[PDB]
């Protein structure tokens, strides 16, 4: 029952200073701008111990599975090959990812009926509002 809260599919509805934790990140222009229209569903689903969470956009389909704690590759919608670790700390999945000596951190969090999901990249935060599709 560790993640009952997420389990469903998110749609995004408000999206604040993301170009800029893009650009932190290092994104290039011409993703950040095809990146920046979109509106993906988050599809969280939990089998056992494992978590799976899906995005859907015009511009990328991909998907995680994990299990908390264990780190596992990922390769991002920007297309970094990152490793990653997803704990739960206090309600909150935190999401960390590492490459080429950097590190981000995304948190998703259940909020009134909404996802909020809260992407760090150094000193810039970007806030991302999902509600249920
Ligand atoms: F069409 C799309 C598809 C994916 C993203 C996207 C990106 C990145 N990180 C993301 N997330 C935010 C939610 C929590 C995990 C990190 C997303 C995303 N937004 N919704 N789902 N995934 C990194 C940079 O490249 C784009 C944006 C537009």
Redesign the pocket.
């Given at each position: 029952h560790m993640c009952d809260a997420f389990v469903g599919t998110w749609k995004?509805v408000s999206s604040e200073n993301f170009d800029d934790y893009?650009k932190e990140?290092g994104?290039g222009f011409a993703?950040r701008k095809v990146?920046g229209m979109?509106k993906?569903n988050?599809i969280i689903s939990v089998n056992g111990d494992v978590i799976t969470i899906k995005?859907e956009?015009?511009?990328?389909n991909t998907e995680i599975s994990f299990i908390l704690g264990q780190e596992f590759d990922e390769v991002?919608?920007?297309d970094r090959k990152v490793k990653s670790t997803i704990t739960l700390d206090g309600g909150v999945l935190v999401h960390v990812q590492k490459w080429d000596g950097k590190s981000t951190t995304?948190k998703?969090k259940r909020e009134d009926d909404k996802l909020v999901?809260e992407?760090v990249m150094k000193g810039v935060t970007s806030t991302?509002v999902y509600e249920r599709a």
């Open positions: 995004l893009m990140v994104v993703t990146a979109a993906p988050m995005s956009s015009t511009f990328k991002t919608a920007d995304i998703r999901v992407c991302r």
